[PDB]
Amino acid sequence: RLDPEYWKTILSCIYVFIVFGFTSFIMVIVHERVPDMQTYPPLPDIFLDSVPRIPWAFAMTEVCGMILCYIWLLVLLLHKHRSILLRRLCSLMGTVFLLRCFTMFVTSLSVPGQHLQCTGKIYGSVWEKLHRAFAIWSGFGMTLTGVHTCGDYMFSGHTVVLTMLNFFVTEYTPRSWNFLHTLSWVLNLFGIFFILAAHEHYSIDVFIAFYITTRLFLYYHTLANTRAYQQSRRARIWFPMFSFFECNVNGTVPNEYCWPFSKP
Amino acid sequence: RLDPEYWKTILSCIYVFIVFGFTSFIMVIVHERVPDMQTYPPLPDIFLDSVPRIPWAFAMTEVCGMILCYIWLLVLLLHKHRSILLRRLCSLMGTVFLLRCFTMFVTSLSVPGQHLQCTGKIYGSVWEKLHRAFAIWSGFGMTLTGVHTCGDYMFSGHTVVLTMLNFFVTEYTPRSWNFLHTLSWVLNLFGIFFILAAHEHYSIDVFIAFYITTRLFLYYHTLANTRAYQQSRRARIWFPMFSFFECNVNGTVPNEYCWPFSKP
Amino acid sequence: RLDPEYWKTILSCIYVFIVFGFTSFIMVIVHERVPDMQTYPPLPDIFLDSVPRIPWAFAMTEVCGMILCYIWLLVLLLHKHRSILLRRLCSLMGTVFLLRCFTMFVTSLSVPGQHLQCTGKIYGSVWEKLHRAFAIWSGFGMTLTGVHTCGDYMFSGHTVVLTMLNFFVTEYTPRSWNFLHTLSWVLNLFGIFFILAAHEHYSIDVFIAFYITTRLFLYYHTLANTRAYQQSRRARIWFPMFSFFECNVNGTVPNEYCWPFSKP
Amino acid sequence: RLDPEYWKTILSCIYVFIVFGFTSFIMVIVHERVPDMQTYPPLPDIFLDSVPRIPWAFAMTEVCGMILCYIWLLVLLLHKHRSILLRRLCSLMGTVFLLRCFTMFVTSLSVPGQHLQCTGKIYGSVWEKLHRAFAIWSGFGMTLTGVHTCGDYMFSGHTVVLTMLNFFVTEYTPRSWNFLHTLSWVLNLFGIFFILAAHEHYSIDVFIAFYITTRLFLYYHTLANTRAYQQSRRARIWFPMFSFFECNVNGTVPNEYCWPFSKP
Amino acid sequence: RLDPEYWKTILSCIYVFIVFGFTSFIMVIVHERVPDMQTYPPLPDIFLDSVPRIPWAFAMTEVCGMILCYIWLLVLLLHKHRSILLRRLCSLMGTVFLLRCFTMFVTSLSVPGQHLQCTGKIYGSVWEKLHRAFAIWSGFGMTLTGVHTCGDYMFSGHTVVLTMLNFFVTEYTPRSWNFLHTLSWVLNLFGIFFILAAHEHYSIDVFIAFYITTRLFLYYHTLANTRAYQQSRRARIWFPMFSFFECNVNGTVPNEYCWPFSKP
Amino acid sequence: RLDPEYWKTILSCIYVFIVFGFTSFIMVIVHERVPDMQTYPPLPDIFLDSVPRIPWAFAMTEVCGMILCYIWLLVLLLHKHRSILLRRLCSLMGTVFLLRCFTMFVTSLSVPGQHLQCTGKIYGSVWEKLHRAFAIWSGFGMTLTGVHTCGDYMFSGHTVVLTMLNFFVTEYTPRSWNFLHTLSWVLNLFGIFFILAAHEHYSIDVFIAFYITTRLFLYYHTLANTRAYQQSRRARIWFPMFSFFECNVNGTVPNEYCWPFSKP
Ligand SMILES: CCCCCC/C=C/CCCCCCCCCC(=O)O[C@@H](CO)COC(=O)CCCCCCCCCCCCCCC
Ligand SMILES: CCCCCC/C=C/CCCCCCCCCC(=O)O[C@@H](CO)COC(=O)CCCCCCCCCCCCCCC
Ligand SMILES: CCCCCC/C=C/CCCCCCCCCC(=O)O[C@@H](CO)COC(=O)CCCCCCCCCCCCCCC
Ligand SMILES: CCCCCC/C=C/CCCCCCCCCC(=O)O[C@@H](CO)COC(=O)CCCCCCCCCCCCCCC
Ligand SMILES: CCCCCC/C=C/CCCCCCCCCC(=O)O[C@@H](CO)COC(=O)CCCCCCCCCCCCCCC
Ligand SMILES: CCCCCC/C=C/CCCCCCCCCC(=O)O[C@@H](CO)COC(=O)CCCCCCCCCCCCCCC
């Protein structure tokens, strides 16, 4: 039966923080490849050529992200099996950001011309790249806490977080609340549109990020519900550290909600 | 039971040749977006920067792609249900080549500098684009029958044909011939490697083309074997013209082989 | 059984004033779009071009509302289930006014020429409008407490209030008092007629206001009497907080009468 | 049983065409009210201010209308009860277009500044109005065959036809073809979008013309399926000549399709 | 039962000469790499530095091969299952020489200093090399019919032929003639010794040639005697055309003797 | 039963270390044969001619060696039968490294031109050879602790250690951990690739050193599992001191893991 294991969530959180630090360092290394990356003319896109740049459109994506994060925290506060829920967010965020690192290492696709005045650059040493990596790490990558000074490459990260939070909010609420689901979907779509309308990413980056996050979520939940980690040697599931986390969870996690405080 | 429907196969062959003629016209519309597309420096890649250009490598991809065609043509000749096999090859080469027109329209990603001397260009009219679209159509896009004069955009097409023929040969041969299966997998991988060694496609062009054809092949044969087109209203299968072709085929197609000629 | 919920009515009451304040906030924003609002000549109307403008007709409509309010208040005073009746008035007046904001925001149609001497306007700030909205909110809209100095837009609220009160008066009275209903009906028609004769709204401003309140009033009661909110997935009700308020009420509310005080 | 009364269908077709003549004539009458109707600035809108005017947008609205009429003719030919589907169409179009005559006559609302170059005007006589109305009558109000040269009024007729032919293709096809049903929505939404983008009608005339036809279609079919016209004294149905047309039809018409011609 | 297949042996015989010709084609290509091939001093060898070069030692090895061939040919003449014995020789000599080409192609190691006066070389063409191959192929490699004029590379074929013939001589004789087997072993060891004493190959050239032929000979017979080619998925045999040739032979071939002619 | 004879393991560990001293001494003897060994041009290879020399490649070979040794020490500590796994490792390394002494002594094969700057040479005496050999003995032949300054000979020792420690991690872990098994292949393959890319050993010394250890490992464990040493007079097993070491072990050793220390 569902066993609250509080010593595995710590491991998952540590794994995700390590993954985020690795992603920041890889981003700095990749940015070190090409010096200018801001002199070319952009590729002919279908949405970046029609809709002109909206200067304030990039903060609205993070506003939507914070709203979704607050809703998800509220959901997590009033649940029975909150440990399993917190252990499933991390094991998926780490994997998707590892895929982002792999995609960004092979080929670097930026947008030629926004953030053209970003300072710093030419970080030639081993101990000066680490300070920039630390800033990007403990700045959360957001544009509000100013870290996002230069541009960003393939496999956008805001879309991943938005889609993951939307899918988790929709999944772990009772199947009778079909207005919060619509609100979350609207927030996700508006965030994606505002990522596209700020001229920060190409259309294909957003599309592949959305598809990859959705497919990985659905596949992970299908494997977890089918309970194939102990059924047989099905396919040797390639999710990093999968059977270590879901071994004690058999079947499907129900949707029981309580109040944790002992003060009515 | 398996009914040989020789008139549904003809409808499938016509469906492909319309799709192949639609893609050839899009590739001329897209080429008119940006005139130069040959002055920029290329994106920083991990394979295009290490391995230098091999001038003869792009011709060996099609040589590897004709051996797999001849081998498959022999399978299509000594089979009982060759009508269904030819109807499944066409129903998939159209769906995948339709996805190529979608991703080549939203954003156009070419390689800045090969085929820099290709003539023609500035096809400003409605009746001169069609003539250029006819040359590509009745040349199969190959570099031997000289049509491939200028560059090519996202979602490479050589990787789609190589991977589709490799999976059909493996699928429709007895599960005891695991040397022809290994030989076909070698021609697939060597053909893919020579696209990158000729500096014709980016390292991410070839990975999403390989992934999509592999994923769509396994998804088609899951539905075709589970037989979900009449089981229930599962998901309203989005494959273009799926239930029209597989309605008369129930279950799985066996692997019986014969000789069609009546002259022993 | 019919359990009077004295804590849900308080939540219901809070809902309607927030919408009342929110509507007032939108009204000042709409007035900011075009400054003049007093140069266009009246559009050709088959009703306004016949009846001359009457300065005292507008005050007569507000008089009728008070009389109808007194009749309804007396009914609420001598009813067994006075808690439920008050909860339905707030759950239906808060929905209609939500539609008023959407109609007024998408397009703005006022009366071109009346109240041309109204003062105020040109509020260039983000704090003065809040005080102006407070004046709009804490004046209840009547001209007796002069707040509505300038013109008004589409889907007038005088018709919403006059019609909504009339239906509750007729609905929650026994089917043997068919003399008060005639008095209530003539008052509603007289009040609506005075609005049109006062040149305060267009003819189509009233008709779509008369239809929407009646359609929503009857749709609310049909669902409540059928109690389909829990029977099955009837229609995926889009009424704001419908199942929450009416979960404890089953069947149809009777028309029993008593005396509220304990001193007969 | 379902007996095709061809003498009743003819009376239905002539009934709707008289309404078309009545609608065209009253359009000239309301035009004669305000002479200029091209000097005012447009009212503030939320969609007519952001999206700029597209000269060719209004042509695509009628292109989608022709396709939706071409599929409907295909459905009309192959349906066994082709004498019933046509009779219901004539009995619904006449009612909706009669409501359009009422709203145009009660009040006038147009776009002040488009189609300012249309000639003619000041048709002050008894007989010249008929000639101008006849030109509109035998032009279908289409712009491809240029008749509609001046502006248009409230309750846009392009929205009704685009929607009425969208809810008959969906309704009168088997409930397993939900791709043509999906396709006919794109033909409707894009036809709705393009008339707004061409600055032909306000953002509220389009919405209340999409709602009325959707409401007046579902209400009609609910009455017919439950045969409430003869079951009892249900509601004194207000559809003009409803019990006369649908007296020989009992129950719901099936979805049986047959080929009428005798040349297999 | 043991069915002599007179048509499979013909297919088996064709296989070995094609490999013999293919090996000869590779030999001339390897000689093209280094032009001199006769300048390096011999590497330090514990066997070559002791035994002086003997000009007539090389001719003695070819003499021993003919004597061993005569003994084997006589056995093949007076055996019941002479078809199977001849089929196995061609199926084992065509596999070892395939490994010879791979070893010789990857690296080229010859004797640095012998046959320094050999003519030919510098064949700059693509047709003259083929005519040289026929000289190599149609001379069977012996020095009696002088073809092997220059040196030879790693994995000498003299050891392969001498060792392969010896094992068949011992294997297919009854276990009571343990005097011919001793004579056969003396011829094999004497022939191998003459190769080393002739300064025609290195010491490691012979050892890895002696091991591979013996290992493959015993591995072939163990699989055939165990008849695991059809018993189960034993080891996924990588022998070229192993199951095809030995499908009709079950168990172990006996050692019955007869007379071939019909005239005793 | 499995009785850990700690007096037998010590005799195994001392036996392998004497072979290490023997191997180091004979390397000096063969080095004294040819003085120059740095003047000849390299033999024609297929991998040493395409890939240019990478100066830092040979360092990564030893880095992978330490990691494979670090994981093995982890396995050697948590295994219940840690006294058996170590004994088999010592009894296999001595046999393989004894074959290396035989092939190095019979013939000499090195890369002519690498490590041409190594000093020393001409160690002509009886006692100085021991001092030079002792330096190689207490340096593990590693280049990180620079002892191996001159060239290396046939049967590369870096291939044996990289492969022997790859087939013990795979063998002596439960048959459900096939990701560390997968990981240890990448460590082996890259260690194999880097020694070739550094121009340290020919392309045939690497292949016949990967084959011998793989063959001599599987053959040993097949003999031990079937206890053929005492079952009968099977083959007169040629492993040096085989029946002595594996006489107290019956059957196959299980995969039970336990913590030896008494501090839970
Ligand atoms: C214990 C871990 C739980 C995981 C929770 C998942 C939520 C994601 C949070 C942060 C992701 C940032 C990635 C760090 C590594 C940078 C990678 C990079 O350098 O790549 C960045 C692209 O430049 C990616 O940046 C982003 O991912 C932006 C996402 C921000 C969306 C809003 C998140 C704000 C949360 C605040 C919560 C407050 C609660 C309510 C407030 C009222
Ligand atoms: C009836 C149809 C059956 C379908 C069979 C599928 C085989 C694919 C064949 C051709 C695909 C070409 C695409 C046409 C539209 C151009 C799109 C474009 O313009 O895009 C092109 C990219 O520039 C795509 O080009 C390609 O697809 C190259 C693939 C060629 C690989 C070799 C095929 C040669 C077959 C010859 C058979 C001979 C038999 C043995 C010979 C000894
Ligand atoms: C416990 C809660 C019960 C709720 C009762 C609701 C009754 C509606 C009353 C007033 C509606 C005002 C809406 C506030 C926001 C306006 C938005 C706007 O600013 O829009 C205005 C449009 O001009 C709406 O104006 C109106 O509300 C016109 C309605 C006037 C009808 C007469 C109302 C007089 C009631 C007085 C009762 C006194 C009792 C007897 C006196 C002796
Ligand atoms: C055979 C039965 C088919 C049923 C189709 C019925 C649809 C009615 C069409 C047009 C009504 C026009 C009314 C005239 C006066 C309107 C007053 C006005 O002036 O109002 C106009 C706008 O204010 C109304 O304009 C329109 O009606 C726009 C609708 C155009 C959409 C395509 C209509 C083409 C119908 C042709 C039928 C032939 C079939 C060939 C198939 C390709
Ligand atoms: C169909 C089966 C018949 C049985 C006979 C099998 C004996 C094989 C003979 C020769 C194999 C030569 C391989 C051809 C391609 C060489 C590749 C290369 O080009 O490589 C050569 C490198 O030197 C290999 O040369 C050799 O084959 C040396 C082997 C010589 C051993 C003596 C062979 C003499 C046989 C004469 C038989 C005559 C019968 C009695 C005479 C009175
Ligand atoms: C109980 C744990 C077992 C560990 C297995 C160690 C295997 C021996 C490694 C190397 C043997 C070197 C022999 C010296 C003379 C070779 C002749 C020559 O000079 O030949 C050299 C090349 O020709 C051989 O070089 C090598 O041996 C390459 C192997 C390097 C890979 C890393 C090995 C280092 C592991 C040390 C960790 C030990 C931890 C404490 C121990 C208690």
**H or E segment at B113?**
strand B112-115
**Bridge partners (DSSP) listed for residue A45:** B107
Interhelix angle for D6-31 vs D128-137, to 10°?
130
**Whole-angstrom Cα distance, residue F163 to residue F208?**
12
- In a mutational test of the pocket of ligand 3, which residue from C161, C165, C205, C213 has the highest number of ligand atoms less than 8 Å from its CB? C161
Which residues does chain C have within 8 Å of residue D154's beta carbon, measured at their own beta carbons? 204
Q: Determine which residue's CA is closest to atom 11 belonging to ligand 3.
A: C140
Which residues does chain D have within 8 Å of residue B236's beta carbon, measured at their own beta carbons? 178-179
What are C120's two structure tokens? 């105020």
Interface contact flag, E43 F103, Cβ < 8 Å: no
Ligand nearest to the CA of D66: 4
**CB-count burial class (<10 Å; 0-12, 13-18, 19+) for A133:** buried
Q: Can you point out the beta strands (E) in chain E?
A: none
- With a 6 Å cutoff on the Cβ, whether E147 touches ligand 5 is no
First to last CA, chain A: 28
**Whole-angstrom Cα distance, residue F86 to residue C140?**
92
Our count of domains for chain B comes to 1
Q: Answer yes or no: are the C-beta atoms of B192 and B160 closer than 8 Å.
A: no
Which residues does chain A have within 8 Å of residue B154's beta carbon, measured at their own beta carbons? 204
Closest CA to B31 of B149, B145, B143, B140: B149
User: Is D107 inside any structural domain?
Assistant: yes
In sign, the C-alpha dihedral spanning E224, E230, E231, E235 is: positive
Among D40, D106, D202, select the one facing C203 at the smallest CB separation. Answer: D106
Neighbours of A15 (CB within 10 A): 17
Instruction: Report how far ligand 1's centroid is from the alpha carbon of D97 (Å).
Output: 55
Neighbours of B244 (CB within 10 A): 13
Task: State how far the alpha carbon of D194 is from the alpha carbons of C118, D33, D188, in Å.
Answer: 39, 29, 10
Interface contact flag, C204 D107, Cβ < 8 Å: yes
Task: State how far the alpha carbon of D151 is from the alpha carbons of D20, D53, F232, in Å.
Answer: 18, 15, 109
What are F48's two structure tokens? 């040493």
Neighbours of F134 (CB within 10 A): 13
Percent helix, strand, coil in chain C, to 5, is 55, 0, 45
- In a mutational test of the pocket of ligand 2, which residue from B77, B161, B166 has the highest number of ligand atoms less than 8 Å from its CB? B161
- With a 6 Å cutoff on the Cβ, whether B62 touches ligand 2 is yes
**Whole-angstrom Cα distance, residue E193 to residue E187?**
10
**Whole-angstrom Cα distance, residue F175 to residue F181?**
9
State how far residue E259 is from chain F, nearest Cα, in angstroms: 37
Neighbours of A227 (CB within 10 A): 13
First to last CA, chain D: 28
State how far residue A233 is from chain F, nearest Cα, in angstroms: 9
Q: Answer yes or no: are the C-beta atoms of D8 and D88 closer than 8 Å.
A: no
What are D242's two structure tokens? 């409803």
Q: Determine which residue's CA is closest to atom 6 belonging to ligand 6.
A: F69
First to last CA, chain C: 27
User: Is B67 inside any structural domain?
Assistant: yes
**Whole-angstrom Cα distance, residue F157 to residue F209?**
8
Range of the domain at C141: 8-245
State how far residue F164 is from chain A, nearest Cα, in angstroms: 26
**Whole-angstrom Cα distance, residue F264 to residue F254?**
24
Q: Answer yes or no: are the C-beta atoms of B209 and B96 closer than 8 Å.
A: no
- With a 6 Å cutoff on the Cβ, whether B65 touches ligand 2 is yes
State how far residue F231 is from chain A, nearest Cα, in angstroms: 36
Interface of A with F (CB under 8 A): 233, 236
Which residues does chain B have within 8 Å of residue A151's beta carbon, measured at their own beta carbons? none
**Whole-angstrom Cα distance, residue D130 to residue D138?**
12
User: Is A253 inside any structural domain?
Assistant: no
Interface contact flag, B105 A154, Cβ < 8 Å: no
Instruction: Report the residue count for chain F.
Output: 264
DSSP class of residue B239 equals S
Task: Indicate which technique resolved this structure.
Answer: cryo-EM
Q: What is the 3-state secondary structure (H, E, C) of chain F?
A: CCCCCHHHHHHHHHHHHHHHHHHHHHHHHHHCCCCCCCCCCCCCECCCCCCCCCCCHHHHHHHHHHHHHHHHHHHHHHECCHHHHHHHHHHHHHHHHHHHHHHHHHECCCCCCCCCCCCCCCCCCCCHHHHHHHHHHCCCCCCCCCCCCCCCCCCCHHHHHHHHCHHHHCCCCCCCCCCHHHHHHHHHHHHHHHHHHCCCCCHHHHHHHHHHHHHHHHHHHHHHHCCHHHHCCCCCCCCCCHHHHCCCCCCCCCCCECCCCCCC
**CB-count burial class (<10 Å; 0-12, 13-18, 19+) for A264:** exposed
Closest CA to F165 of F50, F61, F257: F61
First to last CA, chain E: 27
- In a mutational test of the pocket of ligand 4, which residue from D13, D18, D69, D76 has the highest number of ligand atoms less than 8 Å from its CB? D69
**Whole-angstrom Cα distance, residue F183 to residue F181?**
5
Radius of gyration for the alpha carbons in chain F, expressed in angstroms and rounded = 20
Radius of gyration for the alpha carbons in chain A, expressed in angstroms and rounded = 20
Contacts from B239-248 at CB under 8 Å and sequence distance 24+?
A: B239/B91, B239/B95, B240/B94, B240/B95, B240/B98, B241/B15, B241/B91, B242/B91, B244/B8, B245/B8, B245/B12, B245/B87, B245/B88, B245/B91, B248/B2, B248/B3, B248/B5, B248/B8
Q: Answer yes or no: are the C-beta atoms of B40 and B116 closer than 8 Å.
A: no
Tracing tokens 């981003």 back to the chain, one arrives at A27
Neighbours of B33 (CB within 10 A): 15
Q: Answer yes or no: are the C-beta atoms of B206 and B159 closer than 8 Å.
A: yes
DSSP per-residue string spanning chain A:
-----HHHHHHHHHHHHHHHHHHHHHHHHHHTTSS--SSSPPP-BSSTTTSPP-TTHHHHHHHHHHHHHHHHHHHHHT-SSHHHHHHHHHHHHHHHHHHHHHHHHHB----EEEETT-------SSSSHHHHHHHHHTTTT-TTTT---S---SS-SHHHHHHHHHHHHHHTS-TT-TTHHHHHHHHHHHHHHHHHHTTSS-HHHHHHHHHHHHHHHHHHHHHHHHT-TTT--SS---STT-HHHHSS--S----------S--
Nearest CA in chain B to D178: B236
User: Is E1 inside any structural domain?
Assistant: no
Q: Quickly list H helices, chain D.
A: 6-31, 57-78, 82-106, 128-137, 157-164, 166-169, 180-197, 203-225, 228-231
Q: Answer yes or no: are the C-beta atoms of F48 and F196 closer than 8 Å.
A: yes
Q: What is the 3-state secondary structure (H, E, C) of E201-251?
A: CCHHHHHHHHHHHHHHHHHHHHHHHHCHHHHCCCCCCCCCCHHHHCCCCCC
**Whole-angstrom Cα distance, residue A102 to residue E132?**
53
**Whole-angstrom Cα distance, residue E116 to residue D186?**
85
User: Is A211 inside any structural domain?
Assistant: yes
- Chains A and F form CB pairs within 8 A to the count of 3
Residues with Cβ < 8 Å from B238, sequence gap 6 or more? none
Q: Answer yes or no: are the C-beta atoms of F256 and F5 closer than 8 Å.
A: no
Which residues does chain A have within 8 Å of residue F178's beta carbon, measured at their own beta carbons? 236
Ligand nearest to the CA of A98: 1
- Per DSSP, the three-state class of E107 is strand
- Annotated active-site residue F221? The verdict is no
- Annotated active-site residue F49? The verdict is no
Interhelix angle for E57-77 vs E157-171, to 10°?
30
Q: Which atom of ligand 1 is nearest to the CA of A70?
A: 40
Closest CA to A217 of A155, A154, A169, A153: A169
Closest CA to A154 of A202, A120, A211, A89: A202
Q: Answer yes or no: are the C-beta atoms of C241 and C91 closer than 8 Å.
A: yes
Closest CA to E235 of A150, C136, A203, B178: B178
What are F18's two structure tokens? 């004497």
